[PDB]
Amino acid sequence: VCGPKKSTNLVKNKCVNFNFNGLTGTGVLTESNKKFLPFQQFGRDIADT
């Protein structure tokens, strides 16, 4: 259930504000080598980030 606001082209390898399904943050987006199962959408590390 998201909203009017529109889907900007995905910018990678740049410090970009990102809003993924209401999860907002700051960082660079890079190709990910970890293999998610079909079901998860979020990834977290040992530090709970």
Binding site: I46, A47, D48, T49
Partner: protein
């Protein structure tokens, strides 16, 4: 006492030095103190996050 037993003392020192390496490598607890230090630091950082 040294000069009359120079070869024996040299051999004993060499044997003890040789045994030092094996004694350090055999038991991981010998260096544990230093490891403990590092571990503590890690824990502190971890709990902060």
């Amino acid at each position: 006492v040294l000069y009359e037993n120079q070869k024996l003392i040299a051999n004993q020192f060499n044997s003890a030095i040789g045994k030092i390496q094996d004694s350090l490598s055999s038991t991981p607890s010998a260096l544990g103190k230093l490891q403990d230090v590092v571990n503590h630091n890690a824990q502190a950082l971890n709990t902060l996050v």
